[PDB]
């Protein structure tokens, strides 16, 4: 059965609620982004209206074969009317096509659902600045003070400098980057750009990336592995056995692998700066775990909420345990008392 935190009161709407069958009294199903814990349940047999971004709609049509007549893409930053309710989609700074949703209820309540997001001060100058929000459905993935991480910019600088140095030292080194969903494309694209290479990948991943509207993508990605020195592989193959085997497949073109695993957080962050990160090495294979997050850190999330001053917060992540819930509720109270709302 659908949980309460996926239902928008006073509407016929749900959010990211496709794995529960036909939800009672749902007239429109919203999808914030194309990640499997959120889209799980969609297919060519789905015949209810789905509301989403243009990019998410490309992925629905091409990857899951949802029929076009049921896909309702909305432009960002634009007031739209859905089943008589005004809505706006805003950029969530998560993966490509990821949105937050503002709902303007007929009785005057204003609700923001963040979907998955990485809070940023740039958001303080969208259509959010223009009115009060009464309820916030918040991505609380990293809602605990131990979750610090560097900016995306610092992490990309580290990866580019590391890859550029390694391949300059050894022109026969291969760089490999792990992936298992859309998101974090900047990792492999920035590395390929500094090395003057395209990124080689499977036909299926290349198809997924072509759905995204990324400018000059035919310019950075390819299915011809032979001509590329940056390869993308499934995250599951990013280990010593998987990479030894891949290296065998390249036919003596290469004699070393430098691999990257962009993780969310890892407890090395509590003791280590980005400058100080080192790889795991075995033989002629090195693996770097890099803290590239597409969710808010604790401090980024705190700042966003203290700026927005919602009257009620409803968490959407880590809700399954009483200890997690109570912990998060305590932080929300602190934030409110410290900010004065
Ligand atoms: Ni996500």
From Swiss-Prot:
Coiled coil: none annotated. Expressed in brain, heart, kidney, liver, pancreas, placenta and skeletal muscle. Induction: During mitosis. The mRNA encoding this protein contains an internal ribosome entry site (IRES) in its 5'-UTR. This 5'-UTR generally suppresses translation while specifically promoting expression during mitosis, when cap-dependent translation may be impaired. It comes from the Eukaryota. It is found in: Nucleus. Belongs to the DNA repair metallo-beta-lactamase (DRMBL) family. May be required for DNA interstrand cross-link repair. Also required for checkpoint mediated cell cycle arrest in early prophase in response to mitotic spindle poisons. Possesses beta-lactamase activity, catalyzing the hydrolysis of penicillin G and nitrocefin. Exhibits no activity towards other beta-lactam antibiotic classes including cephalosporins (cefotaxime) and carbapenems (imipenem). Binds constitutively to TP53BP1. Binds CDC27, which is itself a component of the anaphase promoting complex (APC). Binds PIAS1. This is DNA cross-link repair 1A protein. The chain holds residues 700 to 1040 of 1040 of the full protein.
